[PDB]
Design a protein around this ligand. Sequence first.
Ligand SMILES: CC(=O)N[C@@H]1[C@@H](O)[C@H](O)[C@@H](CO)O[C@@H]1O
Ligand SMILES: [Cl-]
Ligand SMILES: [Cl-]
Ligand SMILES: [Cl-]
Ligand SMILES: [Cl-]
Ligand SMILES: [Cl-]
Ligand code: NA
Length: 129
Amino acid sequence: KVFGRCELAAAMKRHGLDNYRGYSLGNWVCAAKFESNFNTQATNRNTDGSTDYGILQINSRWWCNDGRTPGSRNLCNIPCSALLSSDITASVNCAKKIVSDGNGMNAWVAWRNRCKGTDVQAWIRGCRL
Ligand SMILES: CC(=O)N[C@@H]1[C@@H](O)[C@H](O)[C@@H](CO)O[C@@H]1O
Ligand SMILES: [Cl-]
Ligand SMILES: [Cl-]
Ligand SMILES: [Cl-]
Ligand SMILES: [Cl-]
Ligand SMILES: [Cl-]
Ligand code: NA
């Protein structure tokens, strides 16, 4: 599913990402835009042989099982396939695990390079929330 900007802010707010660990909703919407282009079905293979899955491009080296990343972890205890759903529940719950893990939203390179120290509030400007 490809989300609209305000559609995804509301689903993200609904699922409790607004100011989760002090990260305003703008940050999660900004990060989704540049990780996935708001496409739940996004998959991208990494040089290391792991794969990034879904709206927030969660990686199979640590967070999910795709059965093809040898000696990797499944710290969110999900099939990576779960992260491609129209329902973003699995991606959000795993994202809470990742952002809590010591580096916050710096775990998303696109967030650190494109959203961090920017006016992320612009990402929720206009929306009914
Ligand atoms: C929190 C998380 O898994 N984010 C991933 C990151 O791990 C991975 O290195 C990158 C691919 O280059 O995609 C996303 O940024
Ligand atoms: Cl947009
Ligand atoms: Cl914001
Ligand atoms: Cl594996
Ligand atoms: Cl949803
Ligand atoms: Cl933090
Ligand atoms: Na894995």
